C-alpha cells in the first residue's frame, strides 16, 4: 500500500491541479 498517500497528494490537485 502507498498509493494512497500518492493519491492525497492527487486530492490537492484534486482542487487546483497541484
Same mark, same amino acid.
Given at each position: 500500500? %502507498?498509493? &494512497? &498517500?500518492? #493519491? #492525497? =497528494? %492527487?486530492? #490537492?490537485? %484534486? =482542487?487546483?491541479l497541484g
Amino acid at each position: 500500500a %502507498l498509493y &494512497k &498517500k500518492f #493519491k #492525497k =497528494k %492527487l486530492l #490537492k490537485s %484534486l =482542487k487546483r491541479l497541484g
